[PDB]
């Protein structure tokens, strides 16, 4: 076996073709960003929710 | 600590929530606090629970 797999047919692990070590793969950080605004009629400041 | 009545305590202990009540992922799926297999596998594909 050379490649692992997950529910979505995504490779969650892989064998290194040189050091024969098994490495887990995880996607790097992501998420939605929201902008809290008190209304332009009031101010132009904004807060950001990650 | 929860300030809930005993009946409310029984009610909260009988609905398991299917481990779907988690949002954050980092720190290794919150150190297993959020069910790995379901929550993290889902939300690596852009599926978030607010």
Swiss-Prot record, chain B:
Region of interest called Fusion peptide 1, as start-end residue ranges on this chain: 5-26
Domain of life from the UniProt record: Viruses
Positions marked as site (Cleavage): 4-5
Cysteine pairings via disulfide bonds: 29-40
Phenotypic consequence of residue 45 to K: In strain: Omicron/BA.1
Region (Disordered), start-end ranges: 17-42
Region (Fusion peptide 2): 24-44
Functional note: Subunit of the fusion protein that is processed upon entry into the host cell. Mediates fusion of the virion and cellular membranes by functioning as a class I viral fusion protein. Contains a viral fusion peptide that is unmasked after S2 cleavage. This cleavage can occur at the cell membrane by host TMPRSS2 or during endocytosis by host CSTL. In either case, this triggers an extensive and irreversible conformational change that leads to fusion of the viral envelope with the cellular cytoplasmic membrane, releasing viral genomic RNA into the host cell cytoplasm.
Name of the molecule in the record: Spike protein S2'
Organism, scientific name: Severe acute respiratory syndrome coronavirus 2 (2019-nCoV)
Originating gene: S
Residue range from the parent sequence: 812 to 861 of 1273
């Amino acid at each position: 076996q050379q490649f692992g797999r997950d529910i979505a047919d995504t490779t969650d692990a892989v064998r290194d073709p040189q050091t024969l070590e098994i490495l887990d793969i995880t996607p790097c950080s992501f998420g939605g960003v929201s902008v809290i605004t008190p209304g332009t009629n009031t101010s132009n400041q904004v807060a950001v929710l990650y | 600590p929860s300030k809930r009545s005993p009946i409310e305590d029984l009610l909260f202990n009988k609905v398991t929530l299917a481990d779907a009540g988690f949002i954050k992922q980092y720190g290794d799926c919150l150190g297993d606090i959020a069910a790995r297999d379901l929550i993290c596998a889902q939300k690596f594909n852009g599926l978030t629970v607010l």
